């Protein structure tokens, strides 16, 4: 089988600079005839992937000549002139030459924006999820530049970590900011318990940590 | 409109079989090569198989014997049967038309279907509603306890769709848990209702949930 290896894995770019992702073969991948089958998709978040190249430098219908490719032997490359927040998304590259038909692991390219803080919301359990005898307090950070931020929990002011649950959104197609949510996991009798729930967000945009919080009193 | 739409997809378990489908539509189906490439939880995609216009068939080894590809040229259907599935096995199952042009290449692609392997029995999920404790305000849904992926999530039916996103699924103790964010002007809440769709295929779940403000 032919292996198809792509380099870097992940990639950051800014808007109006140029991209470049490769992809390497196992071996050369010339057809009979004198042509390399090697395509290039790209799928963006929740879509299906698309054909923006194939066979090595030729652009598919309704692709703009920002994109381009070239190559041969075993190195190929991909490359996108100034680069709009929409070509945000994985790229693949493919290969129907040999079979079987198989593609690289993809490159997930960036959008770089100016950073920008998190808006924080904290919440509180549901009195619909306290009657089943659990309770769970939420915490939103969103769309905030660059992904990485950290968030401590404190019930009463005394920081808590067993039981937190952090995920975080792809990068967004419109303001390509980044959102998180953080998720304290405790029992109704625990949660009860206690009154003063405070999440805070510590980000790079500040070294004061933007605090949310609230208490069963109201 | 040129298009192709998958079904079929859900929770099976190992060993066990399941039959995918997809309808295509505004084109010529029966002219056309076609194809299953599957794209796994690693976001690696997976050729399966394709089978031309001619009816020649040509299958990834690994699913070689256990796999059937087939076409119905009269309703524009092309089938994929699966037998003996394996855990691997588990990915979303993409559809694609391949285009032939004297070579080739897959110029259409549907939206997918998702398939899970599992021994795992399904657990439908527990739908909990966001309520703050000035401009905008951020509410949300909590959807925890589920399984297997995915469930869809909506905001009043899908009319109120700026301003969100969903947070990618965790798994923890074998079940997934995830929530959802929106934001609107907070001139028109609790004013304008928000309410959260929630629906999940695999136990054939369908909850709707208000989000009340908090007074107590």
């Known amino acids: 089988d032919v292996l198809m290896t792509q380099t870097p894995l992940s990639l950051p770019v800014s808007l109006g600079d140029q991209a470049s992702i490769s992809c390497r073969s196992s071996?050369?991948?010339?057809?009979?005839?004198?042509?390399?089958?090697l395509d290039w998709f790209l799928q963006k978040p929740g879509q299906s992937p698309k054909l923006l190249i194939y066979?090595?430098?030729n652009r598919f219908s309704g692709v703009p000549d920002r994109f381009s490719g070239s190559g041969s032997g075993t190195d190929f490359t991909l490359k996108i002139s100034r680069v709009e927040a929409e070509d945000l998304g994985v790229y693949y590259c493919?290969?129907?030459?040999?079979?079987?038909?198989?593609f690289g692991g993809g490159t997930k390219l960036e959008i770089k924006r100016a950073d920008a803080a998190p808006t924080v919301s904290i919440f509180p359990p549901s009195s619909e999820q306290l009657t089943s005898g659990g309770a769970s307090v939420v915490c939103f950070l969103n769309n905030f530049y660059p992904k990485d931020i950290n968030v401590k929990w404190k019930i009463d002011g005394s920081e808590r970590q067993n039981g937190v649950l952090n995920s975080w959104t792809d990068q967004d197609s419109k303001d390509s900011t980044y959102s998180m949510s953080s998720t304290l996991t405790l029992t109704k009798d625990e949660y009860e318990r206690h009154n003063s729930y405070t999440c805070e967000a510590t980000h790079k945009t500040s070294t004061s940590p933007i605090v949310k919080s609230f208490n069963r009193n109201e | 409109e040129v298009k192709l739409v998958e079904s079929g997809g859900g929770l099976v378990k190992p060993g066990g079989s399941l039959k995918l489908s997809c309808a295509a539509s505004?084109?010529?189906?029966?002219?056309?090569?076609m194809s299953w490439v599957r794209q796994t939880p690693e976001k690696r995609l997976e050729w399966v198989v394709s089978?031309?216009?001619?009816?020649?068939?040509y299958y990834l080894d690994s699913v070689k014997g256990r796999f059937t590809v087939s076409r119905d040229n009269a309703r524009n259907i092309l089938y994929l049967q699966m037998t003996s599935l394996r855990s691997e096995d588990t990915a979303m199952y993409f559809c694609?038309?391949?285009?032939?042009?004297?070579?080739?290449?897959?110029?259409?692609w549907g939206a997918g279907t998702s398939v899970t392997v599992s021994s795992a029995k399904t657990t439908p999920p527990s739908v909990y509603p966001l309520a703050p404790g000035n401009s905008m305000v951020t509410l949300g849904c909590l959807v925890k306890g589920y399984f297997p992926e995915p469930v869809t999530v909506t905001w009043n039916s899908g009319s109120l769709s700026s301003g969100v996103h969903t947070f990618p699924a965790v798994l923890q103790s074998d079940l997934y848990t995830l929530s959802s964010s929106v934001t609107v002007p907070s001139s028109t809440w609790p004013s304008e209702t928000v309410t959260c769709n929630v629906a999940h295929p695999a136990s054939s779940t369908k909850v709707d949930k208000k989000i009340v403000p908090r007074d107590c």
């Open positions: 694609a038309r391949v285009s032939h042009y004297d070579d080739w290449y897959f110029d259409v």
């Open positions: 505004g084109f010529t189906f029966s002219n056309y090569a």
């Open positions: 089978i031309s216009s001619g009816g020649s068939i």
């Open positions: 071996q050369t991948i010339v057809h009979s005839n004198g042509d390399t089958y």
């Open positions: 066979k090595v430098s």
């Open positions: 493919f290969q129907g030459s040999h079979v079987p038909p198989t």
